[PDB]
């Protein structure tokens, strides 16, 4: 027995049961919960992150990443009482939660971290830039005002001549909704092929034993169905992609 | 009197290589057939080498029972025939892609170091990937040009005509025109420079410097990044600036890793 860890998340705006949303926080929820390890959750809005931060002193994860001069502060952050540790970058979570807890199921054992790395670049470019112009779009009128001001703004700023400007020329219903829905399509294939490069279709990338990437994958298709909605008609093509592999997947990571 | 008894020892394993304009000891170059032949010396496996030009190799393929490793990757309809092959008489297997080759000598060699266990193959499938992106594509514009002249006549025309028909539309038009000397070079090699510290950058992800992925243990993933700088090492030369250039990169971390692969 221990006490309840300290898990900053992103609301959007809805009541406390529907309130997570996000896809990187939930990479550290679902960390928690596979380690079925207790937690409470803070909410942090989008403008008051850095700030919040700034107070119980959590690094930043990146840097420049937004404004060139000044550092990347961001969710998910947690706050161990246990230990007295506040890590930032859910990578960095999970490490910390392996070695500060080896009874949990290890996550990221130092034999995946370099392979890992390489599916974050390969999953970037195939899974993430496909499903930001869905994604952001969709989440963006979800949030309250201040935090949807925040997010528009800042998500434009850098994505915006990328992909057309404002967020409503991303995906606009027709022709253009059409292609980046085939080539997001695609790139789920293209990661299911990965899955299944020795003949056989494996449950996750170790195999049958799950690890951090299997999470990774699991968070941006839970947050996907929590923005979209369960019985949302995109939502509903992703449960069947590949053998509706994806839907199994989700229903793995909601079971934790 | 007395008669032999029936040898039982491993036979030499058949391994189609490519050649180049030179002579036996250094008719080998090209990276493909490199993770092979890396694959079979790690494991200490005797082989012997079986020449094949370029135009050759889909004869030579269907003679001998070795099957395509991919569709329409030359023209639209067509199996792709690719070397390397081995064919083992040890059990009358012949076995094509480099990677099938890894699966099929861990498998039937379960004595010798393991190469691709199964619970690499969705990872390292990932990698190949990835790998095609940030090293194969940068690399490309230097490699094949500097091979190609060193081809023997058969093998020139068939890999200028193929390479340049499929990838010289967005590489500037002929070969000379891909990477010339001059800004064109220079920008090009920054490109494949970032390729390479991107890679590096997979391996230091931890805040420590694995000299594998894996950790401590080599795996087939190590061999595809070895196989690859050993040919760039045999086409460039040892003494090649460029190559001296790579030595360098990203705290030496390719100059030790084809330290490890000439020495298995
Ligand atoms: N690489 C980080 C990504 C964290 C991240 O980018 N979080 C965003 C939420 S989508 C954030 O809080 N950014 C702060 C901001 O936008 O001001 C991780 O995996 O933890
Ligand atoms: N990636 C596969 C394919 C290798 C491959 O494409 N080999 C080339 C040599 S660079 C080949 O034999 N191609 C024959 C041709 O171009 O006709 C493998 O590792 O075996």
Redesign the pocket.
Known sequence: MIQQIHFYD?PRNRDEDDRTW????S?TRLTLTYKRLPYKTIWVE?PD??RVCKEIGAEP??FGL?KEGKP?????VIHDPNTGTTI????RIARYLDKTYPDTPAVIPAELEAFHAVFEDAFWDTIFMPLFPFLVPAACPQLNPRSEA?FRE?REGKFGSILGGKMENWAPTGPVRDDRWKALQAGFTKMAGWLSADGQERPFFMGEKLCYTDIVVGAWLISVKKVFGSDHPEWLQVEKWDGGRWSRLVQVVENF
């Open positions: 992103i996000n896809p990187n926080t990479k989008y992150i850095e994860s990146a937004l990347y502060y961001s969710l998910p930032s970058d859910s990578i925040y800042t």
